[PDB]
Structures are given as structure tokens and as C-alpha cells.
Write a protein that binds this ligand. Structure first.
Ligand SMILES: *[C@@H]1O[C@H](CO)[C@@H](O)[C@H](O)[C@H]1NC(C)=O
Ligand SMILES: *[C@@H]1O[C@H](CO)[C@@H](O)[C@H](O)[C@H]1NC(C)=O
Ligand SMILES: *[C@@H]1O[C@H](CO)[C@@H](O)[C@H](O)[C@H]1NC(C)=O
Ligand SMILES: *[C@@H]1O[C@H](CO)[C@@H](O)[C@H](O)[C@H]1NC(C)=O
Ligand SMILES: *[C@@H]1O[C@H](CO)[C@@H](O)[C@H](O)[C@H]1NC(C)=O
Lengths: 109, 168, 93, 168, 168
């Protein structure tokens, strides 16, 4: 890819590349090039959550969302349509009651 | 002098406890194995649902910033449409599980009617409300016999013949 | 003289469910499969998160002054916040 | 001399009308309550479907103009895929409702076979085609008895014994 | 001296072959029509599934090149989400077909229990494991009678009365 700066507004445009092992990244500079001093390597599958909630050192859970966390043993949630990590599905049905027994044939005749 | 019918009773002794209307004034519950059979299947329903929903998710939308609105409209539309698809699937699946749970409850009770009928053959008259009218001196021992599956018309029919037989 | 009556564990008025035949059928015993409990704090029982605060996630590759301490890190969780930014001087990726 | 069988009859008097083959030449229909029970559930099937489809929609595509083709291809693909998903859901749901309707019809008729069997006990021989052979003088009054649920082997069995009994 | 029970037998002669435990040492299989009825429905299950999946597809993604990543992320997300939707639909549909196949197998066998019961009326005692205890000299000819639907209590009951009757 080739690039050229366009004068008329102060801005730094960052561009990125994932360089394969044993390959060589070649750069050609004619100016307006902000060079990296260091590169980056990835280590161990993080979960990038975007949220306003405070941290808690006793709380444990997999589901994170902008308003907090979802800790449950249930397949569905009504809390947020945007979740991170392994989670229950978002539905518009605020109350999906699943019977765990027989119907209530009324106690009084 | 209650007209004993389906043992609604406000029963606390098991989900499928059956009332034994002993003339001596008893109300003992059924063999736990019937209830246990229901428990063995129903309690696992939650886990079956979990395995169908517990998936890895990642952020597509940058909530604290802005994405090109034309794409964002496609994503919002897509997510909303998928939400309705999954909501439909969820309602349908839950409804299926609820209907199946009811069907199971009716099926298990049906099996219990069969247990009485196949063992007594003639002296078990079904009232359609869960009740069998028994034509012999069916005291607590017969309840034990039912629960222990020693209930058998080979002897019990004769005991009822003393109370029911008509020869003509 | 004696009866065998199959009970349905009919407790005092309970709750209702939606089925394939009718909606709002009252049932003795049920559980909700949709939880609405929102825990307003972030769980950290694992490799504790990089709480970027004023630092944005991309900032960790660039090094805004608020990101200087987060230039090299490891965790199973990364937290971004509304006040966070990836730049000090205007830019984009 | 028809071989009266399942009362197909080109019947107009209710969905679940039953033919009473009175030797005197009658063809009266069944208690409307059986038909009504079917009506009470089947007529509501449409409304159950409506509640699952009646949703607010807005235009995404500007039909009289043009949207970037790359996005338009995604939208068309998405809509088409969703159309197949909803078409599948629609066919499946309708098929489920159709199968359930058939199952309901068979279940209700099954209950009506039971109504006859439980009340007569011995003189109701099922032909497997909806017909019961009755072993007593079952004139219009017995049809009224069935519809009024006064049909009872306590008296009717004896009436049949006059026509059926064998002692040995 | 085997305790002949449900004819698991490692049977090769048809899916629904029934063991006839002739005291003379026979193990002949059932009327093929029962098996054929299962075949007529089950073999078509694959075709029913095919008609719901066989659709025209075109390339959206240029696999050997690159598409704008933002759109590609939407497409990959959409396809993956749809894959889960279709995988769910596939698992559910297959599970429904499997449950229905099992229900069909139980239903057909249930009909075969009924065939024996309705024809013999009193001398067919069900063991709950597919076995009927027969109270008469039921040699190969009775098996032919069952398969030819000439099995009839009108004559067979009398043959059993010679072996079973009690007068009191
Ligand atoms: C990287 O290049 C070196 C050159 O000496 C080679 O030995 C090594 O195996 C290469 N690694 C891979 C993954 O090819
Ligand atoms: C997408 O939906 C969110 C709410 O879930 C809304 O804030 C956002 O503006 C929507 N995007 C567009 C482009 O309308
Ligand atoms: C019904 O289920 C709930 C589920 O949480 C349980 O707490 C309750 O005790 C059950 N009711 C009984 C067993 O009467
Ligand atoms: C999308 O489908 C419509 C017809 O429904 C067609 O007219 C339109 O050109 C399609 N869009 C693209 C980009 O092909
Ligand atoms: C889309 O998925 C394919 C693999 O199916 C992957 O190679 C491609 O890079 C993905 N597109 C993007 C933008 O990540």
C-alpha cells in the first residue's frame, strides 16, 4: 500500500499490518512517517469489555456488558443486547417462564 | 365428609404424591419413584436450554463512540431481526418445553393409572379425576402393596369378591 | 370404601406460563429462564483486568501519557471507559 | 341397505357431528359441545399466529433510488436469507399447527369413543371407523341419553342382556 | 429354557419382526406389512429434509482477495449468526424427526399390540415388553392367522376355554 499526507488539517493517521513469521515488512520513507520503535505480540485470549461499572475483587462471572455483569445459570437474559464472553441469548421476551412441574389444577373447587 | 377427588390437597409431599383415602382417615403420599422419574427429566431441561445458548460473543458496535450510520443501521436492523428470530425461537422452544412438560406430567400420571389397572384388573374404577374407587378393604397395607408392587389381583380380587361378587 | 386419588401438588395460587396450546396457563412450579439481575460491578476473579481509565485500548499501542503504564500488559479481561481516549493529538486508525 | 360406516355423509350439521344409525331411519348429528370444543381452540389459531408476526417495519432500501451496491447486496442477501428463515419458520409453524389440529381432531374423537365406552362398558363394539355396534334397542332416546350424559350401563346393560346374555 | 421377552434376538428379518415363541421351537418374523408401513414413512424423511435445504447460493465473499474489513466483519458475523440459526434449526429439526421416528416406532408397535388384543379379546396378556402370553395351542398356524388377519376369538377363545375356563 502507498500513502500520502493531505495538508489542511492536523491529524495523525495510524495504519496497521499483521506480519507473518519469517516475513519481512519493508518500509519506504519520504517524510511524514511516524515510525514505531517497538512492535506487538499477543498473549492469551483477553476479553475487551467496554463498560462504566467499577471493579470488584470478589465478583466472578463470564458475561460483561456496559452496565455491569450477568451472573446466572440461565439460557436467556433481558439485560443487554451487547455482551462479551460466553453468554445467554438476548430476547425481547422479558419473562420466559419455564414450567418445572405440573399445571396448577386449582386447589379449590 | 369430603368428596375425595383429585388429591390437590395443597400437597407438600412430592410433586406426584397420591392421596390414599383410607377409611381410617389417612392421606399418605405416593411412591417417590414416580416423582423422581419426573425430577430426573424436568430438572435437566434447564441444562438442555443452556447448551443451545452459551456461545462466545464479541463487541461489533463501539458503544462509547460512533460507527458509520449506514452500516450501523444495517447492524441494528440485523441484530433486531435476529433478536426477533431468537425471541421467536426462545418462545417457541420454551413453549415446546412447557407443552412437553405438561404432556410428561399427563403421561406419567397415565402410567400410574395403568399401574393400578394392570395389577387389580377389575376393582379399579377410574373417576377421570385421578381417583380409583377400590372395591375391597384397602387399608394402609394396600398402599404399601402398591408402592412395593406386590399389589396383585390374584389375591386382591378374591378379597373384593367377598364384597362385590354376583353370581347369575 | 377406599380411594386412590392422583394428586397434582396444587399449591395456593402460583404463576402462569405460555404454551403451544394456550397462553397464561397457571402452573404449580416453574422457573424464569430470563434473568434481569444486573450486577453493577465488574467481576475480576481471574487475571485482573487492565482498567484503562482515561487510556483507550488502541492507546496501549501508541502511548498517550495516560497510557504510559499500560504499554505492556497481560490479562483475561480489558476494560474501556467513556472518558478514555487513544490520542492526545488528533488522529484515527 | 347401506353398510353404515364412518359418518362422512357429506355432513353439514357441525364439524364433529356423529351419525346415529337408528333402525327407524335416522341420521341426527352429535352433541354440539364436541364441535364447540374444537371451535374454541381452532378458531383462535389464527390469532396465535398473528401475535407472532404483527411487528413494526420501516424502509431500509430506497426503492425509487439507489444505495451503494455493496451494502445493497448485503441487505438483499440478509433479507433473502431472513426470508428463507421466516419462510422455514412459517412452513414449520403452520405444519406444526396443522399436525396439532389433526392430532386434536383425532384426540377429540378419541374422547368421544371413550364417552361411549365408559358409559356402556360392554355393549359398545368399536369398528375402528368411528362406529360402535350397539347391542340393545338404541332408538332416538339413547341418542338423547348420550348427548345428555344419562347414558348408563346400570340400566342399558340390562336392556342388552335381554338381547345378548349367555349363561354357562 | 430362555425366558422369552422382547424379541431383540439380533433379528435380521425386518425392522419390526416379531418373535413367535412356538413351543415346538420356532422364531419366525412378523408380517412384513408392519415393517413396510415404517419404511414407507421413514425412508422419505431424508427427502423431506432435502426440500428444505436445497437452495441456490452465490459467492458474496471474494475468498482469494479482500473486501473492506468493516463490511467483511458484518458479513462474517451475519453468516456465523445465520450458521448458528441454521445449526439450531438443523439440530432441532433432526431432533424432532428423531423423536417423531421413535414415537412412530412406539405407535406402530402399539397398533400391533392392538391387533392382537382386538382379535383375541381375552387370551392376550401383555407383559409390557412386547410379549403376549397366549392361553391356547398357538402353533405356527396361529402365526399365519395373525399375519393373515384370520385370528379371531370367535374360534380361538373356545380353543382357550378348553385350557382356561373356570365356571363358578
Ligand atoms: C525463519 O527464517 C529462518 C532463517 O534461518 C529459518 O531457519 C526458520 O525456520 C524460519 N521460520 C519459519 C517458521 O519458517
Ligand atoms: C443502533 O442502536 C443503538 C441502540 O441499541 C443506537 O444508540 C444507535 O444510534 C443505533 N445506530 C444507528 C446508526 O442508528
Ligand atoms: C417450585 O420451584 C421453585 C424453583 O425455584 C422451588 O423454589 C419451589 O420450592 C418449588 N415448589 C415446591 C417444591 O412446592
Ligand atoms: C436488491 O433487490 C432489489 C429487488 O428486491 C433489486 O432491485 C436491487 O438492485 C438489489 N440491489 C442490488 C445492489 O443488487
Ligand atoms: C471473514 O471470515 C474468513 C474466514 O471464513 C476470514 O478469512 C476473513 O478475514 C474474515 N473477514 C474479516 C474482515 O475478518
Amino acid at each position: 500500500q502507498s500513502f500520502t499526507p493531505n495538508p489542511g488539517a492536523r491529524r495523525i493517521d495510524f495504519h496497521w499490518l499483521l506480519l507473518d513469521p519469517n516475513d519481512t515488512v519493508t518500509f519506504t520513507f519520504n517524510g511524514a512517517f511516524i515510525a514505531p520503535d517497538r512492535t506487538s505480540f499477543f498473549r492469551g485470549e483477553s476479553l475487551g469489555v467496554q463498560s462504566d461499572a467499577p471493579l470488584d475483587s470478589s465478583c466472578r462471572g463470564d458475561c460483561f456488558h456496559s452496565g455491569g455483569t450477568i451472573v446466572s445459570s440461565l439460557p436467556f437474559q433481558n439485560i443487554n443486547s451487547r455482551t462479551v464472553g460466553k453468554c445467554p441469548r438476548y430476547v425481547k421476551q422479558k419473562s420466559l417462564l419455564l414450567a418445572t412441574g405440573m399445571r396448577n389444577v386449582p386447589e379449590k373447587p | 365428609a369430603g368428596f375425595i377427588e383429585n388429591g390437590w390437597e395443597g400437597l407438600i409431599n412430592g410433586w406426584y404424591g397420591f392421596r390414599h383415602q383410607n377409611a381410617q382417615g389417612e392421606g399418605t403420599a405416593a411412591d417417590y419413584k414416580s416423582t423422581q422419574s419426573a425430577i430426573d427429566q424436568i430438572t435437566g431441561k434447564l441444562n438442555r436450554l443452556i447448551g443451545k445458548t452459551n456461545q462466545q460473543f464479541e463487541l461489533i458496535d463501539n458503544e462509547f463512540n460512533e460507527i458509520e450510520q449506514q452500516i450501523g443501521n444495517v447492524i441494528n436492523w440485523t441484530r433486531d431481526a435476529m433478536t426477533e428470530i431468537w425471541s421467536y425461537n426462545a418462545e417457541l422452544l420454551v413453549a415446546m418445553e412447557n407443552q412437553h412438560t405438561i404432556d410428561l406430567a399427563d403421561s406419567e400420571m397415565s402410567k400410574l393409572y395403568e399401574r393400578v389397572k394392570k395389577q387389580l384388573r377389575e376393582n379399579a374404577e377410574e373417576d377421570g379425576t385421578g381417583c380409583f374407587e377400590i372395591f375391597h378393604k384397602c387399608d394402609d397395607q394396600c398402599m404399601e402393596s402398591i408402592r412395593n408392587n406386590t399389589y396383585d389381583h390374584t389375591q386382591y380380587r378374591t378379597e373384593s369378591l367377598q364384597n362385590r361378587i354376583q353370581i347369575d | 370404601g377406599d380411594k386412590i386419588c392422583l394428586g397434582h401438588h396444587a399449591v395456593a395460587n402460583g404463576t402462569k406460563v405460555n404454551t403451544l396450546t394456550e397462553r397464561g396457563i397457571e402452573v404449580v412450579n416453574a422457573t424464569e429462564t430470563v434473568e434481569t439481575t444486573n450486577i453493577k460491578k465488574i467481576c475480576t476473579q481471574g487475571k485482573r483486568p487492565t482498567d484503562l481509565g482515561q487510556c483507550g485500548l488502541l492507546g496501549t499501542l501508541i502511548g498517550p501519557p495516560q497510557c504510559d503504564q499500560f504499554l505492556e500488559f497481560s490479562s483475561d479481561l480489558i476494560i474501556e471507559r467513556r472518558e478514555g481516549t487513544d490520542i492526545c493529538y488528533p488522529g484515527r486508525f
